[PDB]
């Protein structure tokens, strides 16, 4: 008899390939009682069986999705997401890559819209030097931006208010 | 936030027209931290989203409740996943041990014929927990400590 995992129906689905965004989604998942899952394991149960699904995901390569929501994308685009309340986090790096930041994001952000989910955590870019990122719509993000490689003194008030709006 | 409903990942998910195998199913759910389902209201996810699935019926011929819905069962993915069965009363324990056998799931709690029938509920003993809150009402409560014992 194994448990749950977690008391609340939060599953925090996350891709990393060096441990910041791994380490971020447990932070998320502690506030919201939920389960911290890697994509490398995680079943289309897991983006299914939640009332609340979080996606996060650092930007790598060119700007595409980190190499394991990449080859794993498969579980949400067949994961039976309409109507379901869906929020979304990046981590990314505005000063080296800023015509790419958290492209990522906005990439995961196509595909829970494409399979009908309602999107909530919409930030605001004020605070970040970008020129291009494919998580903006009309000066907003369509989640929670993060920078833990030139910005991570801001991670941690970032999270704490947005975790909030989530509830 | 919603709360998952239980501390243990056990699913049991039942069928009833007298409230005799709810009673039971909700008092499975409790001594193993799980939720009760009933099967009128149960989603393929209540079958797949649970390490340990619970499934059981009443005879009245598999009960109609479950043969209605009998699709949740049949559309969801339960290969490699540990399922156990109870019966209310023959049984139709065994027509649901073979709907779980079909989907590839591994079966485990199977118990004793130990204390009168002429059941296709298999090698001599039991599929599941047989049960019969008829006339044996007083001793479900030890065959359930005892079955609950098998599956810890
Ligand atoms: C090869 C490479 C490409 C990257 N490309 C981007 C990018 O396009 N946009 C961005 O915002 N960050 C980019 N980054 C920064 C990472 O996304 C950032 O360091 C992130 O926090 C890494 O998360 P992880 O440690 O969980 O893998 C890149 C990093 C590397 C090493
Ligand atoms: C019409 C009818 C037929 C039944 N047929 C069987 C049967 O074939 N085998 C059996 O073991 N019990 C049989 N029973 C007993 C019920 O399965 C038993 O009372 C059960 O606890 C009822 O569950 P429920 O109250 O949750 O509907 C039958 C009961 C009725 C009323």
Known sequence: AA?????MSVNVI??????????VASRIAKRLQ???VDIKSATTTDFEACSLLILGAPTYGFGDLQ???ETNIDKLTSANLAGKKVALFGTGDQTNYPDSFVDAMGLLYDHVVERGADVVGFTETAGYDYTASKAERDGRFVGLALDEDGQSSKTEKRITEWISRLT
Do not use: M, N
Not at 3 to 7: E, L, T
Not at 14 to 23: K, M
């Open 67 to 69: 190499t394991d929501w």
């Open 14 to 23: 996350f891709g990393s390939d060096a441990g910041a965004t791994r380490a």
């Open 34 to 36: 939920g389960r911290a």
């Open 3 to 7: 448990a749950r995992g977690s008391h």
